[PDB]
Amino acid sequence: ARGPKKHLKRLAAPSHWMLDKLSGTYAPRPSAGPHKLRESLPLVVFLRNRLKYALNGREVKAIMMQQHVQVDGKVRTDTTYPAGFMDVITLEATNEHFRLVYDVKGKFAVHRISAEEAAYKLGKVKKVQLGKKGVPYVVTHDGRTIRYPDPLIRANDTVKIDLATGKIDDFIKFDTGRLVMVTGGRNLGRVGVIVHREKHEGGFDLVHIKDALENTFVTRLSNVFVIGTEAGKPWVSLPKGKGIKLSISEERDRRRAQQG
């Protein structure tokens, strides 16, 4: 109606932000950016609701206006900047590096990483095509455009971005046996290897994935993210739980043993 919306009602916010109902009428509307609104995590949510460094939105803005927060090695001062999957957030004042990777419960884990691993990131190739003057380029899942990619790189592949020069270190071809994290649907956050890709021309290709505990699930290729060349060899540190889904009874047993 006459133009873009600028507000986000609290109840209409993505559920994986884990916002409380009664704290207010509105929720942080993520800005336009590398990641989609529904699949992002604004820095205000990360710094106040997750890390609890800031006590309120005034404080998260005070933190970010002092140039502390970096996303993918670049300073961001937008409190609603849409950080997303595989993004690296650096707070060198506290000497902390985080990567936004889904945990098996469907949420963005607070996943601390070493400084050496915080120097790169992975990106799922969305499309490969030719730019002006016949220069090929790759579009990753976070909207990055890398020119002159390896001519072997195709869609659904994973590239390793140097994240300081923006170049491609090396890549992983999408194929059977590759380590995968699921980035959408009800299997979001699970980690396994590709068992069989079932093609459907004009429809949605389906990928069969086997967990490390030999559990098999099916998910859309659009929800499939290659993160490693084989089982047990991920190119990034996995969050606690290793993307292994436990039943609610198993979780209850594990909590009973963990707590006594």
């Binding site: 609290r10 109840l11 109902k21 009664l22 207010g24 009428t25 039943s247 609610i248 009874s249 209850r252």
Partner: protein, 178 residues
Amino acid sequence: PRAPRTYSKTYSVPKRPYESARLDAELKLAGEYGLKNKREIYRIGFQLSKIRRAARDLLTRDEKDPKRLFEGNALIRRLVRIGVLSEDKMKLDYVLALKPEDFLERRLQTQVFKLGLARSIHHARVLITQRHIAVGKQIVNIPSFTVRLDSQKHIDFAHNSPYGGGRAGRVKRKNQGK
């Protein structure tokens, strides 16, 4: 606006208002437990009716059903924890056999009277309401407080209460100060 806040009723009235058998059973049960009104009996019947409904729903499922095992064990565990269900009756078939007196046994007022801290059940209610009784190190003035098994041994007079080592109350201080 802000998201709505949930609320719900905790009782339900009988369909037939005047029935001597139910009226006599209710009055006998209220007299036994020193209850204020019939609504405190309706509340027990309501929550037992929905405990039974949940157990019946799980009992229609096959044994070894993941949902029956998970929610049945949780419901049994909760009832054993609050002392309503005995430790040798953890079968989800004795849950259906539960009765409102099992729940009224576990009220704070009943436990205060049965621990000897009060002369009668009506003394128990006024002791609770007048902030004399503490569970653990926390004062509880709600008579319907359902006492847990781990809380059973920690029911005693408040440390700052006249009956529990505190200073003398208003009346005594006014009498001995004149």
